[PDB]
Amino acid sequence: AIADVVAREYTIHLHKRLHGVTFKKRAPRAIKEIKKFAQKAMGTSDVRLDPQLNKKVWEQGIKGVPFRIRVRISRRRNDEEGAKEKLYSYVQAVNVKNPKGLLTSVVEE
RNA sequence: GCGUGAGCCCGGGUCGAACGGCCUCUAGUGCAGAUCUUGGUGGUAGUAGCAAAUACUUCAAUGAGAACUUGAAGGACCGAAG
Ligand SMILES: [Mg+2]
Ligand SMILES: [Mg+2]
Ligand SMILES: [Mg+2]
Ligand SMILES: [Mg+2]
Ligand SMILES: [Mg+2]
Ligand SMILES: [Mg+2]
Ligand SMILES: [Mg+2]
Ligand SMILES: [Mg+2]
Ligand SMILES: [Mg+2]
Ligand SMILES: [Mg+2]
Ligand SMILES: [Mg+2]
Ligand SMILES: [Mg+2]
Ligand SMILES: [Mg+2]
Ligand SMILES: [Mg+2]
Ligand SMILES: [Mg+2]
Ligand SMILES: [Mg+2]
């Protein structure tokens, strides 16, 4: 019985998703993979990436995407009256030096 | 419906201002071709294709509608015979 408004932290293993893709498409493909990951995790289909997360993805150039990335995905209410979906997932990067050895963890203020 | 035939006449529809039969006279008088002339239109066919010049991404604004509008941020190229 997970409440709509919920936030978790995940480790996305981007290495196995970007394995073998064209160098000029590595970072955009990682962006799309992050969006798809949030879609699968929160069942929301409306995913918004933090510009800090975009900076973290593009930090090492177009083909230097990190093997793992620690993110926080927060499913929250879309209050816009014209919204086709009632919920959206906003995903940002977690301030950690390395993402190794971390489990999926629920986060609450 | 008539004529072997070229054709002729009528019914119905559309349409809107002229036209026909008979005897003579006259000719720029009869088309499937000429890689014919001009114009229009097909199959091919939603097909060939839209692949040189390294490359785009996130958020926001605008807007009926945004990859190729703009702002910010990031990532890149031209690399002083630019
Ligand atoms: Mg390969
Ligand atoms: Mg009149
Ligand atoms: Mg003639
Ligand atoms: Mg002809
Ligand atoms: Mg002939
Ligand atoms: Mg012609
Ligand atoms: Mg043609
Ligand atoms: Mg094609
Ligand atoms: Mg070509
Ligand atoms: Mg193409
Ligand atoms: Mg090109
Ligand atoms: Mg608007
Ligand atoms: Mg472009
Ligand atoms: Mg060069
Ligand atoms: Mg250079
Ligand atoms: Mg000089």
Side-chain angles (χ1 to χ4, degrees), chain A residues 25-37:
Chain A
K25 278 149 189 164
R26 287 259 172 155
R29 169 93 178 246
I31 288 302
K32 282 162 145 122
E33 288 310 302
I34 286 161
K35 281 183 160 143
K36 160 165 177 222
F37 180 98

Side-chain angles (χ1 to χ4, degrees), chain A residues 58-70:
Chain A
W58 282 86
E59 199 196 346
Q60 273 84 36
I62 196 154
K63 55 179 177 178
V65 187
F67 294 152
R68 286 170 166 82
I69 174 148
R70 187 72 177 172

Side-chain angles (χ1 to χ4, degrees), chain A residues 51-60 66 69 93-94 96:
Chain A
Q52 301 283 156
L53 173 66
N54 186 66
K55 262 212 268 208
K56 185 109 189 174
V57 171
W58 282 86
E59 199 196 346
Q60 273 84 36
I69 174 148
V94 175
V96 284

Side-chain angles (χ1 to χ4, degrees), chain A residues 38-86:
Chain A
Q39 201 276 309
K40 183 178 179 180
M42 293 291 168
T44 182
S45 64
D46 179 14
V47 181
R48 306 168 194 186
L49 315 190
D50 190 39
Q52 301 283 156
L53 173 66
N54 186 66
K55 262 212 268 208
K56 185 109 189 174
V57 171
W58 282 86
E59 199 196 346
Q60 273 84 36
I62 196 154
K63 55 179 177 178
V65 187
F67 294 152
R68 286 170 166 82
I69 174 148
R70 187 72 177 172
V71 298
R72 175 188 290 180
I73 310 183
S74 295
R75 189 171 61 202
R76 31 176 80 151
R77 207 145 254 131
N78 194 342
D79 54 5
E80 299 284 332
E81 53 269 42
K84 183 178 179 180
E85 296 83 44
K86 293 179 179 179

